[PDB]
Amino acid sequence: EPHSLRYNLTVLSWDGSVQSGFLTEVHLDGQPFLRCDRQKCRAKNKTWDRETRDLTGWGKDLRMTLAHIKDQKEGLHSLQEIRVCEIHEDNSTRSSQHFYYDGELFLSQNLETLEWTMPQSSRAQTLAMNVRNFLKEDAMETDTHYHAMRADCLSELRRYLKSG
Numbered sequence: 210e211p212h213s214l215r216y217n218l219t220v221l222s223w224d225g226s227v228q229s230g231f232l233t234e235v236h237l238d239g240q241p242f243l244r245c246d247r248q249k250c251r252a253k254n255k256t257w258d259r260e261t262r263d264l265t266g267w268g269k270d271l272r273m274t275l276a277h278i279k280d281q282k283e284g285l286h287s288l289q290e291i292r293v294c295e296i297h298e299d300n301s302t303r304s305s306q307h308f309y310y311d312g313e314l315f316l317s318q319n320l321e322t323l324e325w326t327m328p329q330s331s332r333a334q335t336l337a338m339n340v341r342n343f344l345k346e347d348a349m350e351t352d353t354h355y356h357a358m359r360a361d362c363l364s365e366l367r368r369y370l371k372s373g
């Protein structure tokens with residue numbers, strides 16, 4: 210009876226140039242459920258029109274987020290966003306958002322409380338502040354946006370469980 214939905218979207222840059230498209234891994238109760246990219250979604254009369262629309266839009270957002278990182282244009286870099294929601298046995302919820310730069314976690318938000326966790330190193334702190342500025346100023350994200358992110362995730366989790 211405890212359930213979880215986990216989205217993992219990755220975008221890449223080469224010599225500072227952000228690559229076309231994206232790659233999303235979705236997990237339902239810990240089991241790999243979908244691989245999605247620019248072209249289509251495929252599981253692991255099959256139609257994924259909701260996921261293709263929503264994940265493409267997120268892909269677009271994260272690509273602009275990576276472009277706004279004032280780091281370096283030498284080699285491969287990756288920005289990776291994880292979105293998680295859980296329904297616990299006692300009907301309570303957890304939900305969070307996590308950013309990874311070149312495999313290292315550097316920023317998290319708890320979507321139940323809207324509090325952010327900043328990293329230890331100054332290098333990671335620079336990345337966190339860059340991203341948080343982009344989200345607040347350029348993307349114009351507000352409390353309602355993050356409340357809505359929680360709700361959307363939970364509603365999707367409930368939708369998938371309702372079918373199978």
Ligand SMILES: *[C@@H]1O[C@H](CO)[C@@H](O[C@@H]2O[C@H](CO)[C@@H](O[C@@H]3O[C@H](CO)[C@@H](O)[C@H](O)[C@@H]3O)[C@H](O)[C@H]2NC(C)=O)[C@H](O)[C@H]1NC(C)=O
Nearest residue numbers: 216217218219232233234244287289290291307309312314
């Ligand atoms: C989010 O999903 C991505 C994939 O879409 C996960 O990355 C993939 O998983 C592992 C670990 O990062 C990689 O495989 C392992 O590392 C090397 C690659 O250098 C590989 O040669 C080994 O065979 C080993 O199994 C895999 O290559 C990697 N794929 C990509 C495209 O990066 C990632 O772990 C997920 N992140 C989170 C935070 O859940």
